[PDB]
Structure formats: structure tokens, C-alpha cells
């Protein structure tokens, strides 16, 4: 079990990062690389890389 929510919003300025607002659920699949992990949008379904400091455990 590893569900993290976005504590803040973010506008993906690239085709790699993602876009969402506080309250959006995210599935952190890999969080070992730099400070950016790859989460999967449970709503849209597209995966991307978001700031790890912008998400926290349920």
C-alpha cells in the first residue's frame, strides 16, 4: 500500500512531468531516483514524474 496525495498543485510544463491540484491521488511506483518520483494519475491514468516534496503518504 503506497498512496500519496499532492499537497499542492503543479502544471506539467513538459510531456514528462504531470499536472494536477492539491487533493489529487497519485500512485508512486518508483521514488529512488533524484527528488522526482514517477506517480500514476488514478484519474486520467497517464503516468509521469512529479516532485516528491509535493506528495505525501495517505
Amino acid at each position: 500500500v503506497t498512496l500519496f496525495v499532492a499537497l499542492y498543485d503543479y502544471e506539467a510544463r513538459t510531456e514528462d512531468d504531470l499536472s494536477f491540484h492539491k487533493g489529487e491521488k497519485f500512485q508512486i511506483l518508483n521514488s529512488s531516483e533524484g527528488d522526482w518520483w514517477e506517480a500514476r494519475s488514478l484519474t486520467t491514468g497517464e503516468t509521469g514524474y512529479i516532485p516528491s516534496n509535493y506528495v505525501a503518504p495517505v
Binding site: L7, Y8, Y10, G34, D35, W36, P51, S52, N53, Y54
Partner: peptide
């Protein structure tokens, strides 16, 4: 390079 990391909204401002 060093991940940018959008600094949260200042020190919890507003």
C-alpha cells in the same frame, strides 16, 4: 542536473 523541485508556497503563507 539538481532536480528543480517547485519550492512549496513559501513557509506555509496564506
Amino acid at each position: 542536473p539538481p532536480r528543480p523541485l517547485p519550492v512549496a508556497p513559501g513557509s506555509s503563507k496564506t
